[PDB]
């Protein structure tokens, strides 16, 4: 009934124009805590369908969510209908990029937590990703049936266990956002927490129990008596959870002004800032592109969040960084399960658009070319595992290049390196599963048979000392650049890594952040380029033509950051300082082909003078094992160059927290299973890049150079600079 496609078309299209009645939400959780069962049962309970959501063949075969999925529901609350745009997100750490992209589109998050496992490593990760986006969280504690049936827990004890979960989530919130904790605090008594069984279609909350005249003792009886279906009639999952969504997650009128504080360095008082804050359909277009996907019938689809304005077929918008207007072909919304085309979409909605040929993940699409773009969408960690990929058949060579480029466009937590001169392309990602799924879907969906090499790690290059000034010279000798280099301080690197500083911020705003983190006032005032992991500082004054030349100097800097001089691995942790410069007065002698090499070579040589070295990625590993198998678990992790960071005993089980190099964790799944007779449960989180041992530098570098087909000799500064 309510979910009839044409009755939902009319109901959604009516609600679409009423931002008060919209809720843009993501469902987020540690792996297997029940996101998709919840999403599926909300859709079913709400009438939108008759697990549906895991559409991909591999998601059903593996019982894992691989891609974010967009659906919507219409839900009545206090005699009014509301449009709930829902994004179900992957739990596995390898697909975390989908969580980060989903979080940019939504204003509220249902954090799902398993009552049995409690808060887990990615519970913290997704909560942090929500709070960094100014997304409001509520809590659904799931699998309460198991808590009741497998632990036979009494009304008072089950309560104590559920309360501990709530307190833990609140502690995480308070630690992440101390200044907004009071507003964000989860209170079971008002109803910001619900508890239930997504699998069995029931849920309760403290206020709902105090009104249904139902107690927790009755819930235990329903489960013990194998009458959970009768419980689902009295305490419907969709009614309790969707009510909580409407009552506690924000509409776009409430949320957009909060979202733009963190996703946009523009002025909230500018014309576009006010239109976005007011969710104005008659403002100019401001569209945040969060996802690129490929449709069988429609072609490429750009999904995103429309903050201001109205979109319709034929309307033209600029794409940030690109010169020409792109023309919308179709616009669509998610209506229950289905992405349906509509005549026009308005601010406040999550939208799907075709025709934006230049759009990428993170693009700003706008009516005015000059609009300040939204911030990039940055994932919590970067690629650490790589394989070589090659077509099995010479007729598929050009197609494989298009396929790999499209794969990385659709998931920028992958990094593709095309080689059209050998065909041995490189694919880097977050983990082995990440790359296994990509390879499978190339063969299945794109019909290109491929080989992949054994996985290897991706290192990072950095420096470990100060060097300079070092002079780089243009090929015509007319232009000179004098560079000093040193490692970033940890607190500064964190600001850069977290995007807390930006060249888009007011100079005063940015410099105060840097100085409070320990940077001197001249370096803070001189910062001119903040890359993803490195900074460039201009210490000069009065050098004529330098401002117009600085973009070329920074291009040379970016070229080095893509692959450092030790082994062509990505560079991180650099503070590069321009101390002096000499420029020819005529622009014909200081164009890109003159200035870019001069900047690049000075930085390359300075790195080799500054104790250049390699960093290797480490994972944090969390191993939950019964006491009987703790010896095998400890031995397995310590045999892989692992170090134990913590051991916590809870009952007759131990939670081991350890760290180990990614390069030492291949085959861990099978080895930890046999070492513990299948009893270990384990998860991971990326820890960071750490310095390789000093007496392994030459051999590590030579091995990388060998793998890449580079010169079999250690680089030296004279390879880059000459008299």
Ligand X SMILES: Nc1nc2c(ncn2[C@@H]2O[C@H](COP(=O)(O)OP(=O)(O)CP(=O)(O)O)[C@@H](O)[C@H]2O)c(=O)[nH]1
Cβ proximity to Cl ion: between 385 and 495 the closer is 495
Chain-centre distance for alpha carbon 408:
14
> Among 24, 71, 83, 92, which residue interacts with ligand X (rule: CB under 6 A)?
92
Cβ proximity to Cl ion: between 144 and 488 the closer is 488
DSSP lists the bridge partners of residue 462 as 613
- Show binding-site residues for Mg(2+): 36, 54, 65
Cα dihedral 304, 308, 314, 316 sign: negative
Is residue 197 at the binding interface for ligand X, with CB under 6 A as the rule? yes
* Residues from 565 through 604 that contact Cl ion (CB under 5 A): 575
Cβ proximity to Cl ion: between 515 and 714 the closer is 515
Cβ proximity to ligand X: between 203 and 391 the closer is 203
Is residue 91 at the binding interface for ligand X, with CB under 6 A as the rule? yes
Least spacing, CB of residue 515 vs Cl ion, in Å: 11
Cβ proximity to ligand X: between 251 and 683 the closer is 683
> Among 35, 132, 238, 315, which residue interacts with Mg ion (rule: CB under 5 A)?
35
Least spacing, CB of residue 136 vs ligand X, in Å: 21
- Show binding-site residues: 29-36, 54, 65, 88-92, 142-145
Q: How far apart are CA 698 and CA 216, in angstroms?
A: 64
Is residue 36 at the binding interface for ligand X, with CB under 6 A as the rule? yes
Is residue 68 at the binding interface for ligand X, with CB under 6 A as the rule? no
For 669, left (φ over 0), alpha (ψ -120 to 50), or beta? alpha
- Angstrom CA distances, 3 to 23, 26, 344, stand at 18, 21, 21
Q: How far apart are CA 464 and CA 396, in angstroms?
A: 45
Is residue 32 at the binding interface for ligand X, with CB under 6 A as the rule? yes
Residues 6+ apart with CB under 8 A from 186: 137, 138, 139, 166, 169, 170, 173, 192, 193
Q: How far apart are CA 163 and CA 181, in angstroms?
A: 18
Is residue 36 at the binding interface for Mg ion, with CB under 5 A as the rule? yes
Per the CB < 8 A criterion, the answer to whether 517 and 492 are in contact is yes
Sheet of 535-538: strand order equals 467-473, 480-487, 574-582, 535-538, 527-530
Cβ proximity to Cl ion: between 407 and 492 the closer is 492
In this structure, what are the phi and psi dihedrals at residue 502, rounded to the nearest 5 degrees?
-155, 145
> Among 41, 65, 320, 601, which residue interacts with Mg ion (rule: CB under 5 A)?
65
Is residue 597 at the binding interface for ligand X, with CB under 6 A as the rule? no
Least spacing, CB of residue 492 vs Cl ion, in Å: 4
For Cl ion, the nearest residue by Cβ is 489
* Residues from 119 through 158 that contact ligand X (CB under 6 A): 142-143, 145-146
- Four-CA torsion 698, 700, 706, 707, nearest 10 degrees: -170
Q: How far apart are CA 448 and CA 334, in angstroms?
A: 31
Q: How far apart are CA 228 and CA 612, in angstroms?
A: 63
Least spacing, CB of residue 131 vs Mg ion, in Å: 22
Piece of 27-35, 235-243, 424-432, 460-468 that binds Mg ion (CB under 5 A): 27-35
DSSP lists the bridge partners of residue 580 as 482
Cβ proximity to ligand X: between 34 and 632 the closer is 34
Cα dihedral 52, 58, 64, 66 sign: negative
Q: How far apart are CA 52 and CA 39, in angstroms?
A: 9
What binding mask, one character per residue, do residues 467-506 give for Cl ion by CB under 5 A, x or -? ---------------------xx--x--------------
**Residue 492 partner contact from Cl ion, Mg ion, ligand X, none using kind-dependent CB cut-offs of 5 to 8 Å:** Cl ion
Per the CB < 8 A criterion, the answer to whether 622 and 681 are in contact is no
**Residue 34 partner contact from ligand X, Cl ion, Mg ion, none using kind-dependent CB cut-offs of 5 to 8 Å:** ligand X
Least spacing, CB of residue 33 vs Mg ion, in Å: 9
- Angstrom CA distances, 162 to 65, 206, 222, stand at 26, 12, 19
Cβ proximity to ligand X: between 88 and 396 the closer is 88
- Binding residues vs Cl ion (CB under 5 A): 488-489, 492, 575
- Binding residues vs Mg ion (CB under 5 A): 35-36, 65
- Binding residues vs ligand X (CB under 6 A): 29, 31-37, 64-65, 90-92, 142-143, 145-146, 197-199
């Amino acid at each position: 009934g309510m979910g009839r496609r044409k009755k939902m078309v009319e109901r959604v299209t009516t609600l679409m124009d009423k931002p008060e009645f919209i809720r843009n939400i993501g469902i987020v959780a540690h792996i297997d805590h029940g996101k998709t069962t919840l999403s599926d049962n909300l859709l079913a309970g709400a009438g939108m369908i008759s697990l549906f959501m895991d559409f991909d063949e591999e998601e059903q075969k593996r019982g894992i969510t691989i891609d974010s999925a967009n659906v919507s529901m219409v839900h009545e609350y206090e005699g009014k209908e509301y449009l709930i745009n829902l994004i179900d997100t992957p739990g596995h750490v390898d697909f975390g990029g989908d969580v980060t992209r989903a979080m940019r589109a939504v204003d509220g998050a249902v954090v799902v937590v398993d009552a049995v496992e409690g808060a887990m490593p990615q519970t913290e990760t997704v909560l942090r990703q929500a709070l960094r986006e100014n997304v409001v969280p509520i809590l659904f504690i799931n699998k309460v049936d198991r808590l009741i049936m497998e632990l036979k827990l009494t009304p008072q004890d089950m309560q104590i266990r559920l309360g501990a979960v709530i307190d833990k989530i609140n502690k995480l919130i308070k630690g992440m956002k101390p200044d907004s904790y009071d507003g964000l605090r989860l209170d079971a008594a008002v109803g910001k927490v619900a508890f239930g069984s997504a699998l069995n279609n029931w849920a309760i909350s403290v206020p709902f129990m105090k009104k249904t005249g139902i107690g927790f003792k009755e819930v235990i009886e329903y489960c013990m008596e194998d009458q959970q279906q009768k419980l689902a009639e009295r305490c419907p999952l969709h009614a309790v959870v969707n009510d909580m969504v409407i009552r506690f997650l924000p509409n776009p009128v409430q949320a957009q002004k909060e979202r733009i504080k963190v996703i946009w360095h523009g002025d909230k008082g500018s014309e576009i800032g006010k239109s976005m804050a007011n969710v104005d359909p008659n403002g100019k277009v401001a569209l945040m592109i969060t996802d690129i996907s490929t449709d069988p019938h429609a072609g490429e689809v750009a999904t995103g969040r429309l903050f201001s304005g109205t979109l319709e077929r034929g309307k033209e918008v600029y794409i940030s960084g690109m010169p020409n207007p792109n023309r919308i072909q179709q616009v669509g919304l998610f209506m229950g399960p289905e992405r349906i085309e509509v005549d026009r979409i308005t601010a406040g909605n999550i939208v799907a658009v075709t025709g934006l040929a230049d759009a990428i993940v993170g693009s700003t699409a706008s009516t005015d070319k000059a609009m300040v773009p939204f911030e990039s969408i940055r994932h919590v960690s970067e690629p650490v595992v790589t394989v070589a990929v090659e077509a099995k058949h010479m007729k598929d060579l050009p197609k494989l290049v298009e396929v790999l480029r499209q794969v990385a466009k659709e998931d920028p937590t992958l990094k593709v390196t095309i080689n059209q001169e050998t065909g041995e392309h490189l694919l880097a990602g977050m983990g082995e599963l990440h790359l296994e799924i990509v390879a499978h879907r190339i063969q299945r969906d794109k019909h290109v048979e491929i080989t992949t090499s054994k996985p290897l790690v991706v290192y990072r290059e950095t420096v470990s000392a100060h060097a300079g000034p070092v002079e780089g010279k243009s090929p015509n000798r007319h232009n000179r650049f004098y560079i000093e280099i040193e490692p970033l301080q940890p607190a500064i690197f964190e600001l850069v890594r977290n995007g807390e500083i930006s060249m888009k911020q007011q100079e005063v705003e940015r410099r105060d952040i840097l100085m409070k983190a320990g940077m001197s006032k001249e370096e803070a005032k001189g910062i001119t380029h903040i890359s993803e992991n490195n900074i460039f500082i201009d210490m000069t004054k009065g050098i004529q033509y330098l401002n117009e030349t600085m973009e070329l100097v920074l291009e040379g800097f970016e070229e080095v950051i893509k692959g450092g001089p030790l082994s062509r691995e990505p560079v991180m942790g650099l503070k590069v300082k321009l101390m002096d410069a000499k420029l020819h007065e005529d622009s014909i002698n200081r164009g890109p082909a003159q200035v870019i090499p001069a900047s690049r070579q000075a930085i390359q040589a300075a790195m080799l003078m500054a104790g250049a070295t390699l960093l290797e990625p480490f994972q944090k590993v969390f191993i939950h094992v019964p006491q009987e198998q703790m010896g095998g678990a400890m031995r397995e992790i310590q045999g892989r160059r692992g170090a134990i960071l913590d051991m916590k005993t809870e009952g007759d089980t131990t939670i081991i927290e350890a760290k180990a190099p990614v390069a030492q964790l291949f085959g861990f799944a099978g080895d930890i299973r046999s070492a513990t007779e299948g009893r270990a449960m384990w998860s991971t989180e990326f820890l960071g890049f750490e310095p390789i041992p000093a007496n392994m530098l030459a051999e590590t570098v030579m091995g990388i150079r060998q793998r890449k087909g580079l010169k079999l000799e250690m680089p030296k500064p004279s390879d880059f600079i000459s008299p």
